[PDB]
Structure formats: structure tokens, C-alpha cells
Write a protein that holds these residues in place. Structure first.
Motif, PDB file in Angstrom:
ATOM      1  N   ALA A  62       0.833  -1.183   0.000  1.00 28.94           N
ATOM      2  CA  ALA A  62       0.000   0.000   0.000  1.00 28.94           C
ATOM      3  C   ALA A  62       0.874   1.241   0.000  1.00 28.94           C
ATOM      4  CB  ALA A  62      -0.898   0.012   1.195  1.00 28.94           C
ATOM      5  N   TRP A  64       3.970   1.455  -0.813  1.00 29.68           N
ATOM      6  CA  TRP A  64       4.684   1.385  -2.056  1.00 29.68           C
ATOM      7  C   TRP A  64       3.819   1.960  -3.206  1.00 29.68           C
ATOM      8  CZ3 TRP A  64       8.387   1.419  -5.126  1.00 29.68           C
ATOM      9  CH2 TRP A  64       8.409   0.712  -6.332  1.00 29.68           C
ATOM     10  N   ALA A  65       2.569   1.509  -3.346  1.00 28.79           N
ATOM     11  CA  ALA A  65       1.680   2.039  -4.393  1.00 28.79           C
ATOM     12  C   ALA A  65       1.532   3.544  -4.230  1.00 28.79           C
ATOM     13  CB  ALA A  65       0.325   1.349  -4.379  1.00 28.79           C
ATOM     14  N   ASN A  68       4.796   5.578  -5.021  1.00 26.60           N
ATOM     15  CA  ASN A  68       4.938   5.550  -6.445  1.00 26.60           C
ATOM     16  C   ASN A  68       4.113   6.659  -7.145  1.00 26.60           C
ATOM     17  OD1 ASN A  68       3.562   4.345  -9.065  1.00 26.60           O
ATOM     18  ND2 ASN A  68       5.700   3.606  -8.959  1.00 26.60           N
ATOM     19  N   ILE A  69       2.797   6.687  -6.929  1.00 24.86           N
ATOM     20  CA  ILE A  69       1.982   7.811  -7.370  1.00 24.86           C
ATOM     21  C   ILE A  69       2.570   9.172  -6.960  1.00 24.86           C
ATOM     22  CG2 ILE A  69      -0.211   9.017  -7.091  1.00 24.86           C
ATOM     23  CD1 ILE A  69      -1.011   5.799  -6.389  1.00 24.86           C
ATOM     24  N   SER A  71       5.398  10.028  -6.582  1.00 25.20           N
ATOM     25  CA  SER A  71       6.626  10.291  -7.322  1.00 25.20           C
ATOM     26  C   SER A  71       6.349  10.937  -8.692  1.00 25.20           C
ATOM     27  CB  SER A  71       7.426   8.987  -7.493  1.00 25.20           C
ATOM     28  OG  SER A  71       6.881   8.146  -8.514  1.00 25.20           O
ATOM     29  N   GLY A  72       5.069  11.141  -9.009  1.00 24.70           N
ATOM     30  CA  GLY A  72       4.628  11.710 -10.279  1.00 24.70           C
ATOM     31  C   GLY A  72       4.389  13.215 -10.266  1.00 24.70           C
TER      32      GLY A  72
ATOM     33  N   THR B  21      -4.065  -4.859  -3.632  1.00 28.22           N
ATOM     34  CA  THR B  21      -2.918  -3.978  -3.425  1.00 28.22           C
ATOM     35  C   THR B  21      -1.731  -4.301  -4.354  1.00 28.22           C
ATOM     36  OG1 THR B  21      -3.386  -3.165  -1.219  1.00 28.22           O
ATOM     37  CG2 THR B  21      -1.157  -3.351  -1.849  1.00 28.22           C
ATOM     38  N   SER B  25      -0.211  -1.977  -7.414  1.00 30.11           N
ATOM     39  CA  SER B  25       1.233  -1.801  -7.543  1.00 30.11           C
ATOM     40  C   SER B  25       1.724  -2.250  -8.898  1.00 30.11           C
ATOM     41  CB  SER B  25       1.962  -2.594  -6.484  1.00 30.11           C
ATOM     42  OG  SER B  25       1.713  -1.996  -5.249  1.00 30.11           O
ATOM     43  N   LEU B  28       0.620   0.287 -11.557  1.00 28.97           N
ATOM     44  CA  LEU B  28       1.438   1.481 -11.403  1.00 28.97           C
ATOM     45  C   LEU B  28       2.869   1.270 -11.865  1.00 28.97           C
ATOM     46  CD1 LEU B  28      -0.355   2.401  -8.225  1.00 28.97           C
ATOM     47  CD2 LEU B  28      -0.201   3.934 -10.207  1.00 28.97           C
ATOM     48  N   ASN B  32       4.785   3.102 -15.086  1.00 25.59           N
ATOM     49  CA  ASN B  32       6.010   3.853 -14.908  1.00 25.59           C
ATOM     50  C   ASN B  32       7.204   3.320 -15.692  1.00 25.59           C
ATOM     51  OD1 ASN B  32       4.625   4.857 -12.051  1.00 25.59           O
ATOM     52  ND2 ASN B  32       5.976   6.321 -13.069  1.00 25.59           N
ATOM     53  N   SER B  71       5.242  15.933 -17.812  1.00 28.57           N
ATOM     54  CA  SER B  71       4.099  15.995 -16.931  1.00 28.57           C
ATOM     55  C   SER B  71       4.290  15.134 -15.684  1.00 28.57           C
ATOM     56  CB  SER B  71       2.842  15.572 -17.690  1.00 28.57           C
ATOM     57  OG  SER B  71       2.726  14.165 -17.776  1.00 28.57           O
ATOM     58  N   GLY B  72       5.472  14.534 -15.541  1.00 27.47           N
ATOM     59  CA  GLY B  72       5.746  13.544 -14.503  1.00 27.47           C
ATOM     60  C   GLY B  72       6.565  14.072 -13.333  1.00 27.47           C
ATOM     61  N   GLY B  73       7.400  13.214 -12.759  1.00 30.66           N
ATOM     62  CA  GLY B  73       8.172  13.591 -11.580  1.00 30.66           C
ATOM     63  C   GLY B  73       9.391  14.456 -11.853  1.00 30.66           C
TER      64      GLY B  73
END
Lengths: 196, 196
Positions: A62, A64-65, A68-69, A71-72, B21, B25, B28, B32, B71-73
């Protein structure tokens, strides 16, 4: 096909450059839409709730997910903030499992990478003391992220800089010079001068 | 699919919670990694050269791909910045094809949403003048992004904000308190106040 493609972009024939450029956009927009399709599915809040699962495995996939988001883009961050991750994450800052702690650190660094308001939502979730305490920490993995995080926060406005000071950073930061680690030694200077 | 999984997240069975979960992940991380396998396939430099294509289609597809990555990190932004996008994007700022102009505004806007060093890269390659000129443009679409773009730069550190004022923003931004549209009256306040 990716590496051939990166060559058709350097090609002379215009049907070649176009073709490859479209494929690259298709790859890039398909990936962004899989990611947006998770934020939009309404998972973030249930994920955020699983940050307090009794089951530490569930907890970690969780986090981690989420991280990750987070990080966008500035809006993946907002969706993570809006789903109320900041408090949960801050709580996870005081965790025994140094892996959970270190992942929560990294997410909070990323969330504090964005706009001054987001840095502020972080500051409001009360990360500051938690993040100042982790400077003392013996594990250099953490000390480093902890310092990154506060440096990211040191980069905001007058009243972010003031809260970093107001939470005790100046002394710890200052005494980090005498740390054997040379990258740490350095990173403290940078953080201090931002603050001034 | 996404909705059955989001329910599984809210379930009681921990087998369910965790199974879902991991699917999240997995979605995602796969999303990525396609984006990443494009940056690491080194297409950024070549897509950036395609920003001066004389083929309008090629140009817009290349510009479309880049602004997605932008548009990302903070690191996608860096990759886009490192590949020399900004010179080209600023140059596209002075375009007659308002479709290209608007897309290049959105790229610069995203890029300007990253760290304060990334805003400075925007400012350094000379977005600011081109950006302030677009403040008089009639196209309300363009006015809004140029304004947003500046508002993002105005959301940077302190030394960033003296270049925004030093570019002319202040004056032009200030006469933008009496524009037919409300969104533009409003959003100039934000920009103006951020600085002030």
C-alpha cells in the motif's frame, strides 16, 4: 522495438521519423493513462487506510503504491495529499520497521518536491519534528533521506523556512558537518544556506 | 478491472486486500516502466531535435510526447531538461500555429512545476519575455497558460520571483485585473500576490 525506434527518430525519411514519434507518444500516453486510471478508480483513500493495516505486508504494498503515485506530477501528489496520506505517512515516520520508515521518508520527500502549498500540507501534517529527530538517527540511509526532505522543505517560502527553524533543524543541521560521511557533510551546508 | 479491485481494497478478507494492493502496484509500476524505457532508450534528444522539424505533424507529435514526459516527476522533467528541450520550446513560444504555441506553453508549464532549479532552467533559457508577451494575446486559451506558466515560476524561491518582476510580469499582470473573463482577473491576483 524501443531501441530501433530511438534511431528512426534520427532518420532522414519523414515517414520514418513520424512513425516512430507516434509510437513513442502511444507508449507514453498509454503509461500515463494506466496510472491516471488508478488515481481515478478511487483507490487512494482505501490504500491510505491500509497504511494502518495490522498486516505489515499489506501495509507495505500500500505504501509502495502510494509513494509511487507521489513520485509523479504535481497532480498525482495532490491526489495523494487529498486522499489524506500525509498524516498516515507522518505516523509511519515513527516506525520500528526501518523499511517502512525509509519508504515513508521517500514518499514525503517526493510530496515535498512540489509547490509551496504542498510543502505546506506536509508541514501541516507535522512532519517537521519527526524529520528533525531522524537527523540524529544512526542509519545513514535514513539520515540522508530525512535531510533531503527537510532540504526540499527548506526550498519553499519564508514561512516554510521559518517552520523548519521553528522545529529545531538549525542545530542538528549545523552539527552534521562533523559527520564522517562526505555527501552528508555537504548536503547540510546546502540546507543551511537555503535557510540562512 | 479497476473497480472490482477498489472494492477488494475495502474488503475484510486480508487475502483480498493484499491481492488487490499488488495488482494496483503492478499496474502502477508497469505504467512507470514504459515511460522510463523511453527515457532510457535515449529518445529524448532525438524527439527534441524533431521540435524544429519543418513537418508540422512530426513537430506536434514530438512535442506531444515530450510534454507527456514533462508531466511527470522531478526526474522526468530533468530528463526532458537535460535533453535540451527548453531552447526549442521557448523558440516554439514565438509560433504562429497557435496549436503548437499552446502545447509548448503546456510543456513549459509542466517543466516549471518542478523544483526551483528546474524553474531557473526555464527562466535561464529565456521563457520569461516570450511568456510575458503572451499576456496580451487575444486567445484566452493562450493567456491562461502563459499566466499559469508564470504563476508556477512565481511560486518558486525568492531569486526566481525577482526575474518574473524583472521580466515585466508585474505591470502586464496588473493590467490583467480588468479582463472580460473572471478566471483571468482571479488568476492574476494569485500570480501578483505570490510575488508580492
Amino acid at each position: 522495438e524501443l531501441p530501433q525506434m530511438t534511431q528512426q527518430l534520427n532518420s532522414d525519411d519523414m515517414q520514418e521519423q513520424l512513425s516512430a514519434t507516434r509510437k513513442f507518444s502511444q507508449i507514453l500516453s498509454d503509461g500515463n493513462e494506466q496510472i491516471q486510471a488508478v488515481i481515478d478508480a478511487g483507490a487512494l483513500p482505501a490504500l491510505v487506510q491500509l497504511l494502518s493495516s495490522p498486516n505489515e505486508q499489506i501495509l507495505q504494498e500500500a505504501l509502495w503504491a502510494l509513494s509511487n503515485i507521489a513520485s509523479g506530477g504535481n497532480e498525482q501528489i495532490q491526489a495523494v495529499i487529498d486522499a489524506g496520506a500525509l498524516p498516515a505517512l507522518v505516523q509511519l515516520l515513527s516506525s520500528p520497521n526501518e523499511q517502512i520508515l525509509q519508504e515513508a521518508l521517500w514518499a514525503l520527500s517526493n510530496i515535498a518536491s512540489g509547490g509551496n502549498e504542498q510543502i505546506q500540507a506536509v508541514i501541516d501534517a507535522g512532519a517537521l519534528p519527526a524529520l528533525v529527530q531522524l537527523l540524529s538517527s544512526p542509519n545513514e540511509q535514513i539520515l540522508q533521506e530525512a535531510l533531503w526532505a527537510l532540504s526540499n522543505i527548506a526550498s519553499g517560502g519564508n514561512e516554510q523556512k521559518q517552520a523548519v527553524k521553528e522545529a529545531g533543524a538549525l542545530e542538528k543541521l549545523e552539527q552534521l558537518q562533523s559527520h564522517e560521511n562526505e555527501k552528508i557533510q555537504k548536503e547540510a551546508q546546502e540546507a543551511l544556506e537555503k535557510l540562512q
